[PDB]
């Protein structure tokens, strides 16, 4: 099999009767990764993300049998406080890279000023301390430091943008690569779209809405706004989630608030939702134990 991480690529000889937990543990041991609960192995079926089941046969999955057979090692779940919950430099680094990619690809909205500060920590992490003798005008010119949306919002040239980033970069002197990547994560985790799984749903009337699923609970959004939910259901505020046919129903732990019901058509998606729900709830509770 071919295992693709954010920064690296592995090749593995897999035994035909091995299970997800075997291949996962193999990748985890190879990386030196002891906090395994955040991660998973991803392939996508028909435009939909899917994850490798631990207790099921590897080749039983819908993954393309055509060689090489390819899975992406990625964080499935996100901590509530990155600095507090990510102990190993390896786990931190994995999150840093994946999150930074989400932000650059505009999977996670970041506003312009924050995006410049984020870019500056990424530069600190890669190049170490700012050195005007080492780093002169044009030194970032081939890097992609900013979302295109931020760049397009202004008339600024690459050197104008380099100047804004370098101005911030200069002030980070003294922070080690891991500390810089963690400062990046502290900012990114406060972004509103950070760590949220979005799914198109519809309510009883048939109004198209968005279901978010994250570490803190469940959220309903107007399709146009992914930043602020119209409704939130914190994990410790919900009695049960129910699924049958194409429908979900959310029953609040307080009987005096209406249950929320919605329709989700695609079946593969619905499993993902339940998976994500169970996973996120589990992690929510264990932080509070």
């Amino acid at each position: 099999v071919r295992i693709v991480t954010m920064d690296a690529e592995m090749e593995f000889n897999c035994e035909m009767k091995w299970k997800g937990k075997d291949l996962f543990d193999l990748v985890c041991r190879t990386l030196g990764l002891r906090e395994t609960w955040f991660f998973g192995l991803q392939y996508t079926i028909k435009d939909t993300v899917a994850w490798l089941k631990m207790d099921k046969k590897v080749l039983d999955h819908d993954v393309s049998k055509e060689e090489p057979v390819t899975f992406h090692f990625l964080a499935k779940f996100y901590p509530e406080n990155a600095e507090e919950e990510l102990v190993q430099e390896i786990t931190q680094h994995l999150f840093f890279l994946q999150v930074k990619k989400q932000i650059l690809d505009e999977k996670v909205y970041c506003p312009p000023e924050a995006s410049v500060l984020l870019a500056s920590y990424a530069v600190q992490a890669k190049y170490g301390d700012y050195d005007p003798s080492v780093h002169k005008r044009g030194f970032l010119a081939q890097e992609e430091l900013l979302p295109k949306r931020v760049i397009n919002l202004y008339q600024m040239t690459p050197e104008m943008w380099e100047e804004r980033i370098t101005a911030w970069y200069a002030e980070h002197r003294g922070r080690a690569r891991d500390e810089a990547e963690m400062e990046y994560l502290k900012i990114a985790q406060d972004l509103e779209m950070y760590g949220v799984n979005y799914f198109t749903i519809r309510n009883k009337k048939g109004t198209e809405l968005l279901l978010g699923v994250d570490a803190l609970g469940l959220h309903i959004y107007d399709p146009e706004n992914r930043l602020t939910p119209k409704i939130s259901f914190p994990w410790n505020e919900i009695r049960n989630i129910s699924y049958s046919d194409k429908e979900f129903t959310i029953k609040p732990l307080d009987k005096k608030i209406d249950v929320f019901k919605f329709n989700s058509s695609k079946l593969r998606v619905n499993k993902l939702i339940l998976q994500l729900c169970i996973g996120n709830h589990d992690l929510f509770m264990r932080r509070r134990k």
Binding site: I241, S244, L267
Partner: peptide
Amino acid sequence: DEEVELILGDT
């Protein structure tokens, strides 16, 4: 499409 329920918490 199997029926699923998640019971969260104890109450």
